[PDB]
Symmetry: C3
Subunit: 159 residues, 3 copies
C-alpha cells in the first residue's frame, strides 16, 4: 500500500497525534487504549517500525504520564536484514515553539535495543518503551501540546 | 477519489528542495487562457523537505497584472501544512524560479529568478495569523526562443534553499 | 502518478518477485514469458527504467536459466537529460541470508553508445525491438544454481538494479 511508501527521513519519523484532548479522556477511561503511528521503514529497504503511545500512561506511568513504545513489524525485506534489530532509537516529544525565538526544548529518551529479549527479533509467519516518558504536569508545560496536537518523533540511527 | 489524492499530497516532497512542474499541451493551454482570463495554472502542493513547509506554484500562461497578454506570470504560495508549528516563521528560504530550456547537455540556459522572501509579505508568515511572484517572468516572444517549448510542454522549476544541517565538527 | 513516485534510492531498485514456484511453473507452460519490474527513475526527474526477468530463460538461457534485462522507457523528463543513457548498471540476484556473508550474484556493464534503446526515447530507430527492448543477461543464473543457498527464500527472489550516479 502506501505503507511501503512511508520511509523515514534519514531514519526519522514524525508522527502527529491530533484531537489530543478527546483522546486523553478516552485513555483515562480505558487505560488500555493505544495510539499507533503509521508504519515506516528505517531506510529504503529496511526494517518496518511502528510507534505507539499511551496518553494516560501504562504500567508505572499509568494515570500519571505519557507512555511511548516502538515495535518491529513484518516487512518485505526482512530476509535481507541483520537480525536482531540492533539500531538505537531516540524518542522525542516535540516542543512546538518557533525555533526562531529559542532552542525549543524537547523531552527525549534513547535506548539501545537489547538482544537479550525476543522483542526485536525477526518477525515471523510490544517492542521497547518508556512508561514514564513525560508526566502530565510536564506535558502541560511549554508547547508540547499545541493546537490540540502532539508530535512524536522517532529517530533511528543509521549506519 | 479526492481522498487518496490528498494523501498523495503528503507524499509530495522536494528533491533536495526542487519542484519540477510540467505543463503540457502548451499551445492549447495558452490559447484557453487567452479565451478565459484570468486563468491560473496550479502546480501540485509540495513540501520543501520532509516535515518541511508546504508550497504551491502558480502560473498564468496569459499573464497576470503587469503581465497580461505579454507574459507568462509566476508566483509561489505558502500553504497551511501539517508541521507548521515546528517551523520558523516567517518563511525565509531562498526561492529560485526557472523556466527550463529543454536542450540536451550535449549546454542550456534557462530563465531564472531568485528572491529572499519578504518578511512583511503576509503569505510568508505563519498560516492562520496571495502569492509573491513575477508578473513578467517570460515574454511570449522569448518563450518561443530556444527550447522553452518542446513537444508542447514547459517545465517550471522551483528551487527552495534548504536549511543546511549543523553537525558537530569532529 | 502512482508510477511517478517510483525512485530511485541512490539509483537503486529492489524488485521482489513473489510466488516464485508458481511463476516458474507458469513460465514453463508458456515459453518467452516475461516478468516486469515496476518502472523506476534513476533519480527524481531522471531517467525511467524497467527491469525484466525470464524465470525460465530467454534466448540462449531458455529453459535453463533466469534471464535478466533492463530497458529505457519514455519518461516525462526526457528532454532535460543527456542521451544516450550512459550510466553503469549492476544486476544482482540477492542471496537472502542474514549478515551473520551473502553470496550475491552480480554483473555490471557499461552501456554502449550505439545501443538503440538507450538513445533518446520516442524516435523509431530500426524496429520495435531496437527502440524498445533492453539489455542484460540471458544466463544470469541457472536453475540448479538458484536452488542453492537462499537465492530463493519463502517463495520469493530479490532482484536488485543499481544505476551508478556519476
Amino acid at each position: 500500500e502506501l505503507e511501503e511508501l512511508s520511509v523515514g527521513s534519514d531514519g526519522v519519523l514524525i508522527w502527529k497525534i491530533g484531537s489530543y484532548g478527546r483522546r486523553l479522556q478516552e485513555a483515562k477511561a480505558k487505560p488500555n487504549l493505544e495510539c499507533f503511528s503509521p508504519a515506516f521503514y528505517t531506510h529504503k529497504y529496511g526494517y518496518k517500525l511502528q510507534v505507539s503511545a499511551f496518553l494516560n500512561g501504562n504500567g508505572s506511568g499509568e494515570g500519571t504520564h505519557l507512555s511511548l513504545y516502538i515495535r518491529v513489524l513484518p516487512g518485505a525485506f526482512d530476509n535481507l536484514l541483520e537480525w536482531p534489530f540492533a539500531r538505537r532509537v531516540t524518542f522525542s516529544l516535540l516542543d512546538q515553539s518557533d525555533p526562531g525565538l529559542a532552542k525549543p526544548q524537547h523531552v527525549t529518551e534513547t535506548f539501545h535495543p537489547d538482544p537479550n529479549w525476543k522483542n526485536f527479533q525477526k518477525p515471523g509467519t510490544l517492542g521497547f518503551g518508556y512508561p514514564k516518558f513525560i508526566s502530565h504536569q510536564d506535558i502541560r508545560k511549554r508547547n508540547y501540546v499545541r493546537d490540540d496536537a502532539v508530535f512524536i518523533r522517532a529517530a533511528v540511527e543509521l549506519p
